Write an enzyme that holds these catalytic residues in place. Structure first.
Site, PDB file in Angstrom:
ATOM      1  N   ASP A 260       6.036   3.394   5.117  1.00 32.25           N
ATOM      2  CA  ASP A 260       6.636   2.135   5.569  1.00 32.25           C
ATOM      3  C   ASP A 260       6.676   1.021   4.527  1.00 32.25           C
ATOM      4  OD1 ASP A 260       3.813   1.807   5.738  1.00 32.25           O
ATOM      5  OD2 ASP A 260       4.023   0.269   7.288  1.00 32.25           O
TER       6      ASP A 260
ATOM      7  N   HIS B  50      -7.101  -0.938   6.339  1.00 36.58           N
ATOM      8  CA  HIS B  50      -6.117  -0.014   6.895  1.00 36.58           C
ATOM      9  C   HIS B  50      -6.052   1.227   5.988  1.00 36.58           C
ATOM     10  CE1 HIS B  50      -2.475   1.742   8.376  1.00 36.58           C
ATOM     11  NE2 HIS B  50      -1.903   1.607   7.191  1.00 36.58           N
TER      12      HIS B  50
ATOM     13  N   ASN C 253      -2.924   4.450  12.358  1.00 37.41           N
ATOM     14  CA  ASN C 253      -3.506   5.558  11.621  1.00 37.41           C
ATOM     15  C   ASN C 253      -4.778   5.145  10.882  1.00 37.41           C
ATOM     16  OD1 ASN C 253      -4.148   7.696   9.943  1.00 37.41           O
ATOM     17  ND2 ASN C 253      -2.312   7.517   8.666  1.00 37.41           N
TER      18      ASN C 253
ATOM     19  N   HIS D  52       0.816  -1.219   0.000  1.00 33.40           N
ATOM     20  CA  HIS D  52       0.000   0.000   0.000  1.00 33.40           C
ATOM     21  C   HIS D  52       0.851   1.271   0.000  1.00 33.40           C
ATOM     22  CE1 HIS D  52       0.588  -0.152   4.387  1.00 33.40           C
ATOM     23  NE2 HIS D  52       0.052   1.049   4.493  1.00 33.40           N
TER      24      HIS D  52
ATOM     25  N   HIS E  49       1.902   3.888   1.800  1.00 36.46           N
ATOM     26  CA  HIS E  49       2.326   4.578   3.009  1.00 36.46           C
ATOM     27  C   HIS E  49       3.847   4.498   3.029  1.00 36.46           C
ATOM     28  CE1 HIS E  49      -1.523   4.639   5.717  1.00 36.46           C
ATOM     29  NE2 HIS E  49      -1.398   5.725   4.972  1.00 36.46           N
TER      30      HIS E  49
HETATM   31 ZN   LIG Z   1       1.051   0.182   9.645  1.00 33.15          ZN
HETATM   32 ZN   LIG Z   2      -0.100   2.138   6.406  1.00 34.55          ZN
END
Ligand SMILES: [Zn+2]
Ligand SMILES: [Zn+2]
Length: 218
Positions: A81, A140, A171, A77, A79
């Site tokens: 990280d 998420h 988050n 995804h 993000h």
């Molecule tokens: Zn995460």
């Molecule tokens: Zn994430």
């Protein structure tokens, strides 16, 4: 077997034969997991790291140990990280696989754009290593996908699955809390015989992690 860098911010742990878990710490010291797959044809990673510094270091570290190059990476995804080192992957000739949605959200978040080639169900085979990517729905994030290794029955839930001691979903500003539960249900209905499941953050567990997460979402 655990291999660590000098700083202790990047570690690689072996789940079994050709499957290892890579973990990096970002400063805010938050850990993030991904996989390293040692195949007969290069190394395949599931997600990168928080930024290009950690990602480059993670890479030159697994390439050094296995004496092979990282050929592909699956971005779960958009993000930091997971797609944090997209720039690093692109300049090293590494293919950043992702759904079309992940690719557009990446550009929207200011990250270089990944391939956007993964469909709802995509089967990839690197050497003798089999990988399946699955989009279970919104959770998420809107674009989150899970990874499944059919030969080991190992599921990489990513940030869609919380570790056993995590009592916080994390988050949810970008999350779809109400649909999250259905999306975990789709993963559960799809994979009946799960052995190990790797959370986005935390220790590798089992299907109990999916049940744990459904509990947090209630
Ligand atoms: Zn995460
Ligand atoms: Zn994430």
């Amino acid at each position: 077997t655990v291999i660590k860098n000098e700083t202790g911010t990047i570690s690689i742990s072996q789940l079994n034969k050709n499957v290892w878990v890579h973990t990096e710490l970002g400063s805010f010291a938050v850990p993030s997991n991904g996989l390293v797959l040692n195949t007969s044809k290069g190394l395949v990673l599931v997600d990168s790291s928080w930024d290009d510094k950690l990602t480059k270091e993670l890479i030159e570290m697994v390439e050094k140990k296995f004496q092979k190059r990282v050929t592909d990476v699956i971005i779960t995804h958009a993000h930091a990280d997971c797609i944090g080192g997209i720039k690093t992957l692109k300049e090293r000739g590494i293919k950043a696989h992702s759904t079309a949605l992940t690719a557009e959200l990446a550009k929207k978040n200011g990250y270089e754009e990944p391939l956007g080639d993964l469909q709802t169900v995509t089967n990839l085979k690197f050497g003798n290593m089999k990988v399946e990517t699955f989009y279970p729905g919104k959770g998420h994030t809107e674009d989150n996908i899970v990874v499944w290794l059919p030969q080991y029955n190992i599921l990489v839930g990513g940030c869609l699955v919380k570790s056993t001691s995590a009592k916080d979903l994390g988050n949810v500003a970008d999350a779809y809390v109400n649909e999250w539960s259905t999306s975990i249900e789709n993963v559960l209905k799809r994979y009946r015989n799960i052995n190990a499941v790797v959370p986005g953050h935390g220790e590798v567990g089992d299907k109990g992690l999916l049940l744990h997460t459904l509990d947090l979402l209630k």
